[PDB]
Design a protein around this ligand. Structure first.
Ligand SMILES: *CC(=O)[C@H](CC(=O)O)NC(=O)[C@@H]1C=C(CC2CCCCC2)Cn2c(=O)n(CCNC(=O)c3ccc4[nH]cnc4c3)c(=O)n21
Ligand SMILES: *CC(=O)[C@H](CC(=O)O)NC(=O)[C@@H]1C=C(CC2CCCCC2)Cn2c(=O)n(CCNC(=O)c3ccc4[nH]cnc4c3)c(=O)n21
Lengths: 152, 90, 90, 152
């Protein structure tokens, strides 16, 4: 079985976009008047930092980013030289809705607009290398229902 | 030289399927990220690949519930990976 | 009793990522389905799980090309599986 | 590692929706005036039949289905008793576009509208059991570009 090369030290960058304060969204976007601050999100940021440092990634944290700021950060990493890296990880911790994540300003970033910045053509030094995105956000307002099953 | 697709070698780990909520315990972190980190720390040293680990995350988060709204959460990976992805601890 | 999410235990095998074409050789069948079937027939007897098999399909289809349009095809599985999925041949 | 039970004989149904003739679409839907018949699709249907019969599934083929006919077929299987089955497979061979597959009549079926018929609530006898969908269709009209990499 073929396995991606994963030997470089560091393995690559692990970006963490950690959005807590949604004051701007509450003031600016009518429909997000009651969008809440994401209390405890730093516990995820810390867990991701501990975990991926242990796995030999260089952690790059960014707290409380608007959509424009998120795109700026991704553009920086898109243009960076990953030639000595074997992998790239981007973690997004925010509010969201169907197919999107929210900036702290309540603007929407389509998930594809984030991931597609690191295609082979746009980031050639990651060509052939794993690009991993972890998205912690809602993707809508529905409570997924449960179904009864036999216990394992 | 060889050519592969522009969008090859991606892994997208979503905390939830489309249309639905995911959960954050303010005193512990999110169901998804906390489960992910626990599974990575336990299984990466054993040489397990990321799809196996993310399957475990699906299993673990599926057993959690929101007793206020009778809600569940179903995470959902999507991938264009062409090889096994392991994160060696050494 | 135990409860799991309504949308648990799905595997969706897409011939292509969103926005893009997939290919059908009129004399052989589709790149995706023909690759899928070949990998299933070879690997299921060995006990390999479906995510491993679909990773191989990603690899194989990624090496094919459309020399008329300089096109590629990138298949893409998505899953809410909570366990390993094997199709035993016995 | 936990593994889905996969011991029943047959394992389950393997539906194959095999759309070849798009005459109706060409006559009825203006924008699909030149949508082509899917010559050679029977080779996929046959390959899937051989492969999944070998793996102990009961094959249920359906050729040249409109969207309404596809929904009728899925409703039949949704209401069927899968209690003695360990798995369900549905294969769709057709034209498509972003997020949808086409009926032979050129009507659109959102992929979620097909898969969501077999959720735990809608098909309880498949609760806790793998439900596998293979979709062979375009998801748009763009030719995915290639990127150069080192040969394995
Ligand atoms: C919707 C989102 O994007 C965020 C994602 C995030 O913060 O990671 N999800 C929530 O905020 C989540 C969802 C809701 C549902 C609402 C539906 C209508 C539209 C707005 C969203 C509610 N919300 C919320 O208030 N909290 C924070 C408080 N959490 C708990 O009390 C709690 C959660 C889980 C848990 N496990 C054990 N103990 C607890 C306590 C949410 O996380 N959600
Ligand atoms: C778009 C679709 O939904 C179908 C899916 C299907 O039939 O499985 N895809 C095609 O039909 C595929 C795509 C195109 C691109 C067009 C872009 C503009 C809008 C319409 C679609 C063209 N098309 C097509 O004509 N053929 C049939 C002929 N195939 C070959 O000549 C061929 C393909 C692959 C191959 N490998 C080796 N030899 C060959 C020969 C397509 O399959 N496509």
């Amino acid at each position: 079985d073929k396995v991606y090369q994963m030997k470089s030290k560091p393995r690559g960058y692990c970006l963490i976009i950690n959005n807590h304060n949604f004051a701007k969204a509450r003031e600016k976007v009518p429909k997000l008047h009651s969008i809440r601050d994401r209390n405890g999100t730093h516990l995820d940021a810390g867990a991701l930092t501990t975990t991926f440092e242990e796995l030999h990634f260089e952690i790059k944290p960014h707290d409380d980013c608007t959509v424009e700021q998120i795109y700026e950060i991704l553009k920086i990493y898109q243009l960076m030289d990953h030639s000595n890296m074997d992998c790239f990880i981007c973690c997004i911790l925010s509010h969201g809705d169907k197919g999107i994540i929210y900036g702290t300003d309540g603007q929407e970033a389509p998930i594809y607009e984030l991931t597609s910045q690191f295609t082979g053509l746009k980031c050639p030094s990651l060509a052939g290398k794993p690009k991993v995105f972890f998205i912690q956000a809602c993707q809508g307002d529905n409570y997924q229902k449960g179904i009864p099953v036999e216990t394992d | 030289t060889r050519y592969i697709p522009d969008e090859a070698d991606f892994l997208l780990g979503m905390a939830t399927v489309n249309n639905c909520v995911s959960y954050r315990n303010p005193a512990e972190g999110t169901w998804y990220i906390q489960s992910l980190c626990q599974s990575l720390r336990e299984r990466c040293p054993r040489g397990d690949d990321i799809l196996t680990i993310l399957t475990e995350v699906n299993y673990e988060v599926s057993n959690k519930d929101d007793k206020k709204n009778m809600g569940k959460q179903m995470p959902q990976p999507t991938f264009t990976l062409r090889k096994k992805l392991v994160f060696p601890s050494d």
